[PDB]
Symmetry: C2
Subunit: 108 residues, 2 copies
């Protein structure tokens, strides 16, 4: 009977258009690549927060006495065909992969 | 000056050989492709848990009184070039991606 401090939602994203690369640059994702009688699509498995506060208090199961808390996304980096102002290239881009809890010393 | 409820450590993995694909099968990852001496390497950004218990009562910031808790590694899925000894193909494979706090209502 386990459970999570923060709630995830997962989605297959087949139409991403913008993203931030591992150098922190904003880049455009080429979701579709019409290479002749064939079409290549880029899909990403993204997991994000259902909400930044599961409970009004912040994250579920937290000691709201001494701890402020919120639920936030973390990321991995995945290679993706992209373009910037200059060139098309495979670049590592960040994508949401999990929802996690952020703490913070309470004002006490 | 914020705190994580689940401590993680991240590495880059560039010599992956074995994995589990999204169909649950065990596959071989082809780390490098050599084309005319030009070498394409696959790298994976993996995030795992430091320990199941950062704090001794499991996760940090948890109402130890009402809740039992123990951080744990979760995964995501990532395209990689692989073979199942029957075929070489890009398959979505499982990747350690975050360290999250698991909730368990203890007996009051
Ligand atoms: C920095 C640098 C690296 C430089 C270059 C990296 C070079 C090449 C990466 C590359 O050729 O992609 C291969 C491609 O994913 C394989 O296609 P797949 O069958 O998975 O997709 C079917 C279709 N997208 C669909 O699902 O419909």
């Amino acid at each position: 009977g386990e459970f999570s401090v923060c709630d995830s939602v997962s989605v297959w994203v087949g139409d991403k258009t913008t993203a931030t690369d591992i150098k922190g640059k904003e880049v455009t994702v080429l979701a579709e690549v019409n290479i002749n009688n064939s079409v290549f699509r880029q899909y990403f498995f993204e997991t994000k927060c259902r909400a930044s506060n599961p409970v009004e208090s912040g994250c579920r199961g937290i000691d709201s006495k001494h701890w402020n808390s919120y639920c936030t996304t973390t990321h991995t980096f995945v290679k993706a065909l992209t373009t910037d102002e200059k060139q098309a290239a495979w670049r590592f881009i960040r994508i949401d992969t999990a929802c996690v809890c952020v703490l913070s010393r309470k004002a006490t």
